[PDB]
Symmetry: D2
Subunit: 481 residues, 4 copies
């Protein structure tokens, strides 16, 4: 069965046909389109900036999530969780990105931009409407209550999204434990959902920063990372009309190993070209960025000793120099060193919060959101477009019905059953962007904060670099009538 | 010249023709429409709640603003500002609602939802593009920097919007003062724009809470407050299908005097009916609400002694009782006492922040935004609809131009000149909702947080009370193509 | 019966005999002594600074407290408290300064530096040991829990110290109310001790800043304020060896009226001298000081228009000028304008927190604490010195008793009965400085933060101005043996 | 040369002679005395509680500090500091405990309780009076400014006290670096004193928690830890009259290894007794205490799996059980589980802040401070008692001199030279408790917050357990005269 990284690999395998009409032809197929929420005149962009993980380096699915899952389960068992966790196995059909974990009640929630509950799952049991009112009287959560609610926003969170559901299901059904509203009881030991969640969160961090996940990734890069020969071509085209920079949270050693792989072709920008080191594609390279803090105060600007991969002692005070690698600093480092203002910058990333929302809101940067799942989402949205149309029709009929003073009822049931049918085509937690006719929190933040978005940053290759990406003018309801 | 309260008074004078087809006929004229951002099934609404000032009690314009202006200037002169302030006179053509005062540089700003500068005015001098980059390098402000930026969000802020521009203009041009980036210098006295702004803000508060403004309003209610005979009819219709409540920041004595006027007709809900006291229209009356805090922790629930208008000593712990008047409490007081959940409640108000955003985001209430200016805005938007169309056309042409590698230039100038022409038809600070093709912060918050909105809450009279207000389903760009 | 302001008036009436040996003779009588906690070489002091209220202007007792009490009770009755409050009457024998009001349980507490309970009074009923453990299991309070505990530190707090005890007693014994652990219940109205306390606190503030207290004080200054002809003499002697400044929280108009009275004699510094305006005694005059904030960030430095008593608009940026009066600013204003460092400054005040602790800890100023009660305290401490000696003896015997494995018991009772006997000689809440052999919080803060202290600042007149006030070197226990 | 752990080992070697008159004889020699700041009736103590590191487990000096120093220097060199650091070598004559590191200017400071500078050392250069005013205009620091000032309060801080001085000296004198007010410059790399200090701090933590320090300690316990056969005797005597508990920040595995060593004798409480496991001496054992947080909210109470040394999953909710080992929790865990109030508890520790100040102030616990250096301090204070007397005499003479209007000058120089002579007998940073006649911050906090204190907790063995430790009643200056 074809995953979303599979469709990315297919396109990644194909060479760049830069014939002008092949590009137009290519960029009307929606897989290869750049989609536009707010209008952007590429001619005015002076700096193209990049995230790395799941932006330049898309990890293959479900291999990477499975590996992260396996390593996280073993960290938990190693710290004392029960051995039965080792029989868990990652199932990519369950988790959708952007879910909310309620650490009070142990539910995964899919919500809209206002915190309305679209899906509620306790372990693997999907709680429906009336049952959810017992815990959510108004069917609503205050998502800015970040002490209770954790939003699982990155593809790095997909393993723990599934794992948390596994854990709830396990403790709920294992007779050694007694279920309570707020966690599980085994004699004089009480395990709250909240402390369960913290352990999972800690295990994921540890696996990434003290465990073996990076090691296992780098020793089988072909198994775990998508490679695309068109990347050096896109970056060198960008270098011709402007400056290119890298700003990543990862450290230098991991960044160097991953980026060496991403440029490991028998050629440079195009076949026949001398191969060039990955660093030569960037006017500025910054690691340990600590985004989103990076877009505020940031941290002290350091200089990487690239021979040892350690930071040099002290704050770096000097000029932008060929060959230098920076660590920490802030968004103002980029602006100062490349002589750019926020709106001269297109920053390309995959973290809707850490890359897009914060650079937009706090600095006025232009934004490009990479959504790796979009390839699969697009395939499903077109296949089952019929169901969405029926959903629209049923809503219009439901209105032209209330306006005539138990028919309104069978429609509401028909609406709920089409919604479910549509949602199941994406997975058990439904599409990334909606549940039926109701848009997700994630969808609404994409529209709000990503000026452009696409299945992959590479789709920029298919647009001339003076292109004006145009969204339609937005009208308030009273401006139409 | 016809102000926005003038169009509200015209409709306010007309009797309710409750013939079913006259209502349909009436509610297709846009002045009398309820506009829909998100869909709402009125059948499911159990409680209708109300703000008072500029919701139930719309103050006549420009009389009320002029009075507030005059009293505020006299408070300033009385505390030491120069006597020339007394020659100021309120000019309603200057201020638009929702402007941002930059206390650092002394500018009034009209911004979009992202903080991009649409208009910059220093005193009465409109700073244009390149000049604004000197202070706004990226043409952008971080509007959540509430220590520097004050958003003038209510019609109560219209006098001080004009006054601040008056003050900057005066000090800038009076030779006793020397202009600096950050304020004005008169020998060894330095007056920052920030301290100037605080004085204005303080003077407005004082005028409202220790000055004579309330006194002068209540002694000529006919001069200062719109009255509508259809209000008791709307409220009694609401009482038939649900509960009605009042939740206002004003105190009991001012509330009683204003509401007595709003119901002061020789009849009750309709002509021929016995007149009823205003309190009998409400299942729950709450004053000193302290919104938006009201929608969080709130404050301690007190009980008003309605004979004296003072609070009884102690926290009120009892049941909802006929005749009782509440003070403070929280949104949960309403929910508890009327046995409602957030989505059973339609709260009707005019404070985009204090009434709508906070009740929506923090409690999941349904929202109705009253926008008194909308009558005038609608008259202008239709009159000069030609200019907006040309604006759309020029943007489409500007794109089909960049896509062909100094023509792009004269168009950009034509875009800037139509934008200006369009904006001047609303006033010197343009429409409440846009500058040309760019929507304002205010417009974007209306769309985001007001489920319904209208020139007046009374437009609900023209819709049957099982009506399903329907917005179109929203699609992301990739969902269309 | 002779109050503490009475002994201050007696000394205030006597002329300055500046014969060198009369001064030595005078300053060995303890009423007129300056007492020394840490050593201070007056020769090194460059600036003498002053508080006004209860430092330069000592209010007569019990007239002033009675007036503040009467006006505070009437504010409460006027806001809705019951009429029986008007029969309350200030009783100076009850309150001691420095008591702690527990807003949770409605008790007045006398504590030591560690929060140990020395006295607990609910209304007028003194709770003893075992009964107090019901609410204070460890007989201890965390006095830095300023949300629950209010320390009544100034002589301005003496009326509300008594009033709070009156209120608790009244509600406790009035049959309309039902006592609970945390307040009082009258049907559906619950009045917590905490909300009771806030009303009292608010009523005191209001009386001082919006009521008639200042008016009534200034129209009978002879009834309410101690006057001393030796004050202009002390200040002019200080001006000869250094700079003098005034830094008070009171506003200019009240300060001017009070200081005019304090210098209203038919002469200047000494009899025969031309009278001089009070301002001529000060190198720097600062009102609206907002201490203790004054000793941190402070506030913006303003300049008083002394003709109108209003502040000039703007921040004052100029030099120290003859005749100028300052408002707000910070401790650094003094240091800058008088060219002094913290340890060149002796600041003389009566607020153990607002004047002494904060200037010492945050700025390293030298400190002089005025304790008006000390005259009365000294009279009592010497009269009943016998009881304290017996207290010492009983403790030594109690030790040489435990060290020999129900005798230890009758001693503990004898210790408790002498303690009570001693305490009652000062008033119902005992001495300011101790309960028996246990020092109060207040006493311990005097020793810790007041370099010098005295019944009145005027005692400095009796010491030559190169005098080295010497405390004994302090030794830790292991340094003696 | 005899260090302070040397004198502790001598006493540690001697067997307990429990003859009643040998105990009296022993506890009058000051090495073996318990010193008394506030009176304490041991008869009333119900729970004896213990810290471990530098309380029960005193590390030998200078071996332990040298090892910590060596491992910390290697961590720094390993992270990039220059190789010359490896030639550093710990010098125990330099650092005194309780010094303040000013991260702004790179000075070590010895201060008094008010922040007055007693000693200022930049690297190894002792800055004197007038030179210090350049950076400390008022010769004073605000020690509660914990962002700038770090107080080196534990014997664990002795290596980094010396190291920081080494680092400043090195960078100051190495010609590769250019000295600035705030740090050091090497081309485009600027190393602030603050970032230098953070690295040192981080290196010490890392060495303790991820490095080899614990490993190296546990493999040569005889080299690094004082052992005393009288410890099991003291604890079992305590168990007879009350409950004993352990509350330590260290984890279970390190605690078990250290405590096994402390009880590793061929006998139990006394020679001839069966050996008992260290756990059997405690009614409650708590590790991972996280003091001082422990004395506030604390953390979640966990249960240690003593077989694996890992925590069991979940919060422990059960009763106090024989054999159970607790982790985290709060001071209230002790109180609940042992049924004690704060003043029934004597907690014995060496952290003046983390053990004594916080338990006293926040919980009202009785306190015993272990000061390992006191043995050496006592030896020096008695040897050079002559110099302190001369210091007293010179102060009295300096006063009887000012009181007679350049003699006052040669005395001030004589005072400064005796002070220096006295201080050098303790080390280059002087006594822990004073510089000449001025007490240190540390000394003043001992007097304020340690009810009892001693060179070792074992001195309690020499007092019968109904003993009343008596301090003299404290008198304010006016209470003497
Ligand atoms: Mg990423
Ligand atoms: Mg819903
Ligand atoms: Mg309103
Ligand atoms: Mg723009
Ligand atoms: Mg005072
Ligand atoms: Mg006690
Ligand atoms: Mg310790
Ligand atoms: Mg000094």
């Amino acid at each position: 069965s074809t995953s979303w990284s599979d469709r990315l690999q297919n396109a990644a395998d194909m060479p760049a046909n830069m014939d002008k009409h092949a590009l137009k032809k290519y960029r009307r197929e929606a897989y290869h389109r750049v989609f536009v929420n707010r209008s952007l005149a590429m001619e005015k962009i002076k700096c193209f900036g990049f995230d790395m993980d799941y932006t330049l380096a898309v990890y293959k699915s479900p291999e990477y999530e499975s590996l992260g899952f396996e390593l996280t389960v073993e960290r938990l068992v190693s710290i004392g969780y029960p051995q039965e966790l080792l029989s868990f196995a990652y199932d990519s059909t369950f988790p959708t990105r952007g879910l909310v974990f309620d650490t009070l009640y142990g539910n995964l929630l899919k919500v809209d931009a206002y915190g309305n509950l679209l899906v509620c799952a306790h372990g693997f049991n999907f709680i429906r409407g009336p049952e959810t009112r017992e815990q959510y009287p108004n069917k609503f959560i205050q998502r800015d209550d970040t002490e209770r609610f954790y939003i699982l926003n990155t593809l790095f969170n997909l393993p723990e999204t599934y794992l948390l559901a596994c854990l709830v299901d396990f403790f709920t059904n294992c007779p050694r434990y007694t279920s309570c509203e707020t966690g599980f009881k085994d004699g004089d030991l009480f395990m709250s959902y909240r402390s369960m969640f913290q352990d999972v969160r800690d295990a994921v961090d540890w696996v990434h920063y003290k465990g073996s996940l990076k090691e296992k990734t780098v020793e089988n890069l072909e198994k775990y990372v998508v490679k695309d020969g068109k990347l050096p071509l896109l970056l060198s085209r960008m270098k011709e009309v402007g400056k290119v920079f890298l700003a990543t949270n990862s450290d230098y050693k991991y960044t160097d190993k991953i980026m060496t792989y991403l440029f490991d072709f028998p050629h440079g920008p195009k076949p026949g070209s001398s191969h060039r080191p990955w660093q030569s594609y960037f006017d500025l390279i910054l690691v340990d960025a600590r985004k989103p803090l990076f877009f505020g105060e940031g941290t002290v600007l350091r200089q990487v000793d690239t021979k040892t991969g350690k930071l040099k002692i002290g704050t770096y005070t000097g000029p932008l120099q060929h060959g230098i690698v920076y660590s920490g600093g802030s968004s103002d480092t980029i602006c100062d060193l490349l002589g750019a203002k926020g709106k001269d910058i297109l920053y390309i990333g995959d973290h809707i919060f850490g890359d897009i929302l914060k650079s937009k809101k706090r600095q006025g940067w232009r934004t490009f959101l990479v959504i790796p799942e979009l390839a699969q989402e697009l395939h499903v949205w077109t296949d089952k477009s019929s169901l969405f149309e029926e959903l629209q029709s049923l809503d219009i009929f439901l209105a032209e019905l209330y306006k005539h003073l138990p028919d309104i009822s069978s429609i509401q049931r028909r609406i709920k059953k089409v919604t479910h049918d549509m949602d199941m085509c994406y997975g058990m937690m439904g599409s990334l962007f909606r549940s039926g006719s109701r848009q997700t929190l994630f969808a609404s933040q994409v529209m709000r904060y990503a000026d452009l978005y696409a299945a992959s940053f590479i789709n920029l290759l298919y647009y001339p670099f003076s292109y004006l990406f145009r969204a339609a003018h937005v009208l308030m309801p009273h401006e139409s009538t």
